[PDB]
Every structure is written in structure tokens, then in C-alpha cells.
Write an enzyme that holds these catalytic residues in place. Sequence first.
Site, PDB file in Angstrom:
ATOM      1  N   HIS A   1       0.789  -1.338   0.238  1.00 52.39           N
ATOM      2  CA  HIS A   1       0.064  -0.147   0.377  1.00 52.39           C
ATOM      3  C   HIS A   1       0.851   1.062  -0.102  1.00 52.39           C
ATOM      4  CE1 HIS A   1      -3.722  -2.925   2.834  1.00 52.39           C
ATOM      5  NE2 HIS A   1      -2.985  -3.127   0.512  1.00 52.39           N
TER       6      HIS A   1
ATOM      7  N   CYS B   1      12.379   7.778 -14.362  1.00 52.21           N
ATOM      8  CA  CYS B   1      13.434   6.679 -13.863  1.00 52.21           C
ATOM      9  C   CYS B   1      12.749   5.630 -12.986  1.00 52.21           C
ATOM     10  CB  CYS B   1      15.242   7.177 -13.619  1.00 52.21           C
ATOM     11  SG  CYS B   1      14.802   7.665 -12.304  1.00 52.21           S
TER      12      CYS B   1
ATOM     13  N   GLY C   1      -1.140  -9.010  12.967  1.00 49.43           N
ATOM     14  CA  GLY C   1      -2.339  -7.629  13.195  1.00 49.43           C
ATOM     15  C   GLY C   1      -2.776  -7.336  11.433  1.00 49.43           C
TER      16      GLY C   1
ATOM     17  N   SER D   1      -6.888  -7.916   9.891  1.00 49.23           N
ATOM     18  CA  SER D   1      -7.945  -8.027   9.656  1.00 49.23           C
ATOM     19  C   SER D   1      -8.310  -9.166   8.177  1.00 49.23           C
ATOM     20  CB  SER D   1      -9.287  -6.837   9.996  1.00 49.23           C
ATOM     21  OG  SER D   1      -8.999  -6.750   9.204  1.00 49.23           O
TER      22      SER D   1
HETATM   23  N1  LIG Z   1      -1.806  -4.717  19.752  1.00 47.39           N
HETATM   24  C1  LIG Z   1      -2.317  -6.217  19.131  1.00 47.39           C
HETATM   25  N2  LIG Z   1      -1.542  -7.538  18.769  1.00 47.39           N
HETATM   26  C2  LIG Z   1      -2.416  -8.354  18.091  1.00 47.39           C
HETATM   27  N3  LIG Z   1      -3.609  -7.687  17.075  1.00 47.39           N
HETATM   28  C3  LIG Z   1      -3.498  -6.689  17.121  1.00 47.39           C
HETATM   29  C4  LIG Z   1      -3.475  -5.688  18.079  1.00 47.39           C
HETATM   30  N4  LIG Z   1      -3.778  -3.927  18.383  1.00 47.39           N
HETATM   31  C5  LIG Z   1      -4.276  -4.099  16.902  1.00 47.39           C
HETATM   32  N5  LIG Z   1      -5.233  -6.074  16.341  1.00 47.39           N
HETATM   33  C6  LIG Z   1      -5.382  -6.097  15.677  1.00 47.39           C
HETATM   34  O1  LIG Z   1      -4.765  -5.572  14.466  1.00 47.39           O
HETATM   35  C7  LIG Z   1      -5.972  -6.112  12.960  1.00 47.39           C
HETATM   36  C8  LIG Z   1      -5.178  -4.642  12.332  1.00 47.39           C
HETATM   37  O2  LIG Z   1      -6.872  -4.859  11.062  1.00 47.39           O
HETATM   38  P1  LIG Z   1      -6.839  -3.290   9.907  1.00 47.39           P
HETATM   39  O3  LIG Z   1      -7.084  -1.783  11.151  1.00 47.39           O
HETATM   40  O4  LIG Z   1      -8.148  -3.747   9.458  1.00 47.39           O
HETATM   41  O5  LIG Z   1      -5.804  -2.873   9.296  1.00 47.39           O
HETATM   42  P2  LIG Z   1      -5.208  -3.638   7.989  1.00 47.39           P
HETATM   43  O6  LIG Z   1      -3.580  -3.780   8.077  1.00 47.39           O
HETATM   44  O7  LIG Z   1      -5.640  -5.328   8.206  1.00 47.39           O
HETATM   45  O8  LIG Z   1      -5.651  -2.627   7.069  1.00 47.39           O
HETATM   46  C9  LIG Z   1      -5.134  -3.609   5.198  1.00 47.39           C
HETATM   47  C10 LIG Z   1      -5.955  -1.905   4.885  1.00 47.39           C
HETATM   48  O9  LIG Z   1      -6.744  -0.744   5.377  1.00 47.39           O
HETATM   49  C11 LIG Z   1      -6.805   0.155   4.885  1.00 47.39           C
HETATM   50  O10 LIG Z   1      -7.854   0.545   4.328  1.00 47.39           O
HETATM   51  C12 LIG Z   1      -5.398   0.531   4.418  1.00 47.39           C
HETATM   52  O11 LIG Z   1      -5.365   0.943   3.245  1.00 47.39           O
HETATM   53  C13 LIG Z   1      -4.613  -1.066   5.020  1.00 47.39           C
HETATM   54  O12 LIG Z   1      -3.419  -0.918   4.481  1.00 47.39           O
HETATM   55  C14 LIG Z   1      -7.223  -5.896  13.706  1.00 47.39           C
HETATM   56  O13 LIG Z   1      -7.910  -7.028  13.378  1.00 47.39           O
HETATM   57  C15 LIG Z   1      -6.799  -5.315  15.292  1.00 47.39           C
HETATM   58  O14 LIG Z   1      -7.633  -6.158  16.510  1.00 47.39           O
HETATM   59 ZN   LIG Z   2      14.263  10.090 -12.418  1.00 50.79          ZN
END
Ligand SMILES: Nc1ncnc2c1ncn2[C@@H]1O[C@H](COP(=O)(O)OP(=O)(O)OC[C@H]2O[C@H](O)[C@H](O)[C@@H]2O)[C@@H](O)[C@H]1O
Ligand SMILES: [Zn+2]
EC number: 2.3.1.-
Lengths: 282, 277
Positions: A124, A135, A198, A200
Site C-alpha cells: 500500500h 526513472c 495485526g 484483519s
Molecule cells: N497489539 C495488537 N496485537 C494484535 N493484534 C492487534 C493489535 N492491535 C490491533 N490488532 C489487530 O490488528 C488488526 C488490524 O486490522 P486493520 O485495522 O483492518 O488493518 P489492516 O492492516 O488489515 O488494513 C489493511 C488496509 O486497510 C486500510 O484501508 C489501509 O489501506 C490498510 O493498508 C485488527 O483486527 C486488530 O484487532
Molecule cells: Zn528520475
Amino acid sequence: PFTADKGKCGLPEIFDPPEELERKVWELARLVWQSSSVVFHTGAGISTASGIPDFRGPHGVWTMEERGLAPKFDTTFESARPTQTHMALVQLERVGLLRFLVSQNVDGLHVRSGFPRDKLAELHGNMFVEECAKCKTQYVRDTVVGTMGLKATGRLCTVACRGELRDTILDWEDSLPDRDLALADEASRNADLSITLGTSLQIRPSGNLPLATKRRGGRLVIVNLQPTKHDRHADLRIHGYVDEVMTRLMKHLGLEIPAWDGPRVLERALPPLPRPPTPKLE
Amino acid sequence: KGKCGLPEIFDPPEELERKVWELARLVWQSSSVVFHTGAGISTASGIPDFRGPHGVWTMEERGLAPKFDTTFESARPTQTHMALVQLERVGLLRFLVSQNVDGLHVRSGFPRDKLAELHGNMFVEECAKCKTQYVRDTVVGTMGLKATGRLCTVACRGELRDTILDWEDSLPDRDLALADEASRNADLSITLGTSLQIRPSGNLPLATKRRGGRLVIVNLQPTKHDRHADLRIHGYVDEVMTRLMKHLGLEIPAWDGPRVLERALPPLPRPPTPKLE
Ligand SMILES: Nc1ncnc2c1ncn2[C@@H]1O[C@H](COP(=O)(O)OP(=O)(O)OC[C@H]2O[C@H](O)[C@H](O)[C@@H]2O)[C@@H](O)[C@H]1O
Ligand SMILES: [Zn+2]
Ligand SMILES: Nc1ncnc2c1ncn2[C@@H]1O[C@H](COP(=O)(O)OP(=O)(O)OC[C@H]2O[C@H](O)[C@H](O)[C@@H]2O)[C@@H](O)[C@H]1O
Ligand SMILES: CC(C)n1c(/C=C/[C@@H](O)C[C@@H](O)CC(=O)O)c(-c2ccc(F)cc2)c2ccccc21
Ligand SMILES: [Zn+2]
């Protein structure tokens, strides 16, 4: 954009109880040891312990928006420190127990932690990276690139070029970068263990890459506080703080989690260091 | 529970840059610097504060829960925590007063004989008979100074109780006296991440003012005593402390993992002082 499908937000957290947590992190240990080719997939949950809110957790950006509240930052992107998890992944790559790392995070903490770029796919984009429109030379800066959605930053390429520099932050419409998505895809198919930390797993195709580890009998582990899209395809689901799961895992692997030198950029992985000998599993 | 959820202030970079230089000057010019810390120095390790936008009391008033991004056991000390460890080792920090019960000062290896934990420490239980403290590796499971279930093992068998004060409980006299003594005698109090609304923990910085000492407040929200501060800095404490250290010519040291240091070690070498004006 405004109306974009932001998927299921604010789902209940699940905490595995200590005994069951203790036994699942041993099962993880057993899978790491047993596997030739381990890919890690990370999402916004690895950076919350450093003050950066997630997207779809209880107090995440999209969750609080649905409720008419603001997400809260306990740090800047520039002052964010890598978590115990970040550094743990740095060590696992240096001793050859991590083949490849696929991150949906734009927070730039992977690169700043000194993890090698040629073993990372930033699907992302990265808020500290701008890219020459001509380039394709990337610049890893010490402060966030001021724009999002792949626009002109104001700066020009300085290669042996003068091309327009642009941010690397995908908008909703923007297709993933081809290099990162091919390298993330190839690493995912060929792995015999994918571990997710971390995320979803609701985003296409970033969330589907761990399923590619399943084809040809690879194993899948999901570490997450909330339910994920693909929970039913996981051979192991751990419900705990990733930092707690990763420090317990490292301890089992007999690995110290290294000091963070401060912001450092490593283009190319170094030769692999020595690692403990493997337990007899049976 | 006092005023909660007040708006944040952000100093603009040029102003922030300038103030942290004025902080640096006061540290160099000062014979005896005490730091007073609150819930705000642990947010960046995933532990919520009390009266910030998403803090315990704030979210309670709005019928919402405070969020933990770590356990107390898995929390790492912040860059600020480790900066206070190095300042103490190079003799530029006389004393540290904390209202935090999060246990991270002790776990960061900051020396106990130079710290006052005014509201207690979740990892410490105290013998009801001989007052021997035990710094454990997991949180003592009670709060409000109740029996934990474990007994004193000194050369005793007395009832171990938690050190977490409830609302009615008086501060520990040793910790309050040492905190009070260090505050009166200092020519610089700096407050980091505290709103200074609790008595007397919040009033100790004011004792530095008596006999013409200086007061710095570092906080995102207004504090009770903003009006008595010679310098107020509105930024993330981590940003202020890393920039501050850089001016002092000091590395922020690596965290070895949970470590307990009873007694401050001999002071280490520190950079020479700038010529100031
Ligand atoms: N300390 C922790 N330990 C474990 N799990 C955790 C913790 N804190 C949070 N979580 C879990 O971490 C999870 C995080 O999921 P999400 O928040 O959907 O993030 P993505 O990285 O999947 O989002 C993807 C894209 O969506 C966006 O549009 C952007 O474009 C992003 O790039 C949750 O289910 C939390 O419970
Ligand atoms: Zn260049
Ligand atoms: N990263 C940050 N940088 C700077 N300031 C911050 C940051 N995060 C939060 N703050 C500020 O940090 C401040 C925290 O204010 P309070 O939550 O009252 O913490 P206390 O330690 O003073 O509360 C004292 C006692 O009261 C309770 O009953 C318990 O007994 C406590 O022991 C806010 O003003 C934030 O703006
Ligand atoms: C005060 C300190 C030990 N203390 C408590 C504890 C707070 C609550 O158990 C008591 C409170 O709710 C009622 C009262 O005022 O008597 C919490 C805490 C808050 C909410 C949470 F979900 C879990 C723990 C907490 C968090 C960080 C630092 C100190 C903390
Ligand atoms: Zn005793």
C-alpha cells in the site's frame, strides 16, 4: 472514496486465556522450526503498541469515523519507534528463519527498523518514500512525504534526470505496485508457512496472499485480537497482543530481539547469521 | 476525576524547535533538575492515560472503554523512559517523581533510590509487618493495598499487600517526603505527560518555584499550573526528549529487558557544557 467499502469495523476482541496462549505459541515455534520457507504478512496491528492507531479495531480510523469520533495518535510518524514485533522480524530475517515479509502498512517503520528492502513488499506504499515518475528511483526520506494518492511532492529526481517525484500512497482506485505484488505473490505461493500479524485480512488482494500459502499443503497461522476474513482457513489462530506472542516465540527460538539503532535504511539483506540448533520434534 | 478531554495544543515546528533549545539551556544552567512524570509518558507504549482524548476517565464520561495496545507485562519503556535513565546516569537528573503505577520506570532499570512512585507500582507488593518490597515479573493481582495471597520470605511470614493507593489512601510518606524534599531543593522541575490536577502529586512542581527555581511543563493538553511555568511545550514528550538529548549530545540507551536496579551507580562521563550567552 467517501463511499468506499471500508469492510467490517469495530468487531469484538478475543483474548486466548494464558494456558491456551502458552500452548499456541509453542505450536507456532514447532511450525517455524518445521518449515523451509516462512513468509510474514503484517498489518496496522503491529504498530499500535508504538502509538499509531489501526483501521478496523475498537479505536481505529474507520471504526471511530462510523461513530463520529477521531482516531488518536500517541506519536508522529517521524517519532514512532518500531515495536518489539518490528525488531523481532528483523532478527528472524538475519538468522534465515524469515524468507520474505509482505506489509500493508504505510507507517514506514519496517524500513526504519533496518529490515532489508529486497525482502519486503510494501503493498500500500510508504509515507517516507517518493518515486521518480521517469526513472522509478525511490528516495527514502527522514520525514513523511507531504502528499498521498501518487501526486507530485514538489521535488525533482537527482540521478546522474530532473523527473517529477511523487508519493507512493495508493488511493482506493490505485492498483498495487507490480514488483511488490509479484514478489509478495511469488513468496506466498512458494512458502510452506505464512504467519499474519495485526491484519484483519479484509483487503483484496493483500489479504488473499496468505491463502496462496494453503495451495500445495502449506500451513497458515493468524495472530490477531479480532476475527479476520480468513479465520476458517488458518491451521492456528492466536488471539493476543502480537508483541506478547512474538517475544514468547523468540524466547522459544532462543533469539534475542535486537536494539533499534534509530532510523536506518538497508537496501539489500546481509549474509545470514548463526542460529540455534533445532529441537527434536518427536 | 477533574477536567477530562480538553483540546490538544500542537506547537508549530519552528516554535517547538526553539522551546526545546530553551529547555536545553535550562538543563545546562541548572545545578539540580527533578523530573515529574505522569500517564502521558506511557501512551506511546500502548497504555492509555486518564484525562486525554481517549483516556480512562474521558472514555468513562462518554460511556466508552479505554483501549490497551499492550499488557502491563509486555509494555516496553518509551524513548522518554530510557532518556530519563541516561540523564540520571550522567548526573543531569537529581530525582524523578512519578504518579504512574505502570511499573515501566523500575523495569527500564532506573534506580529505585532516586525515584518516588507516589501512587504505587502494580509489580510491587510490600510486607505489612517489615515493609520489605518485592518487585515481581508479573502484575500483583490486587489494587487498593489488599492481601495478595503471598507471605514475606525475609530471614517473617507477614501479609504481602499491593502498593496501589485507592482514592482515600494517603501517599507513602517516604516517597512523598523524598519527592517533596527533592522538589523544594531543585532549581529546575520539568513535568512530562502530567495534567497536574491531583493533590499533592501535582503541586510538587510548584515547590520548585519557591526561592526562584524554574518550572517547565511538557504536555499536549492544558495543565492545572500552566500559568506558573517559565516554559510550556505542546508536543509529544518522545519528540521533545529525543530532540533534547540530541542537544545534550546524549545517546538514548538500549533497553536490556525487564531489570530492577535498587541503588544509583556512580555517575558516567557527560559532554562539556556550551557557553550560554
Ligand atoms: N497489539 C495488537 N496485537 C494484535 N493484534 C492487534 C493489535 N492491535 C490491533 N490488532 C489487530 O490488528 C488488526 C488490524 O486490522 P486493520 O485495522 O483492518 O488493518 P489492516 O492492516 O488489515 O488494513 C489493511 C488496509 O486497510 C486500510 O484501508 C489501509 O489501506 C490498510 O493498508 C485488527 O483486527 C486488530 O484487532
Ligand atoms: Zn528520475
Ligand atoms: N505522547 C504524549 N506526549 C505529551 N503529553 C501527552 C502524551 N500523551 C498524553 N499526554 C498528556 O498526558 C496527560 C496525562 O494526564 P492524566 O491522564 O491526568 O495523567 P496524570 O498522570 O497526570 O494523572 C494523575 C493521576 O490521576 C489518576 O487518577 C491516577 O491516579 C493518576 O495516577 C494529559 O494531560 C495528556 O494531554
Ligand atoms: C488506577 C490504576 C491502577 N489503573 C487502572 C484501574 C482502574 C479501575 O480498575 C478502577 C476504576 O475504573 C474505578 C475507580 O475509579 O475506582 C487502569 C485501568 C483502566 C481501565 C481498564 F479497562 C483497565 C485498567 C489503568 C490503566 C493505566 C494505568 C493505571 C490504571
Ligand atoms: Zn515481612
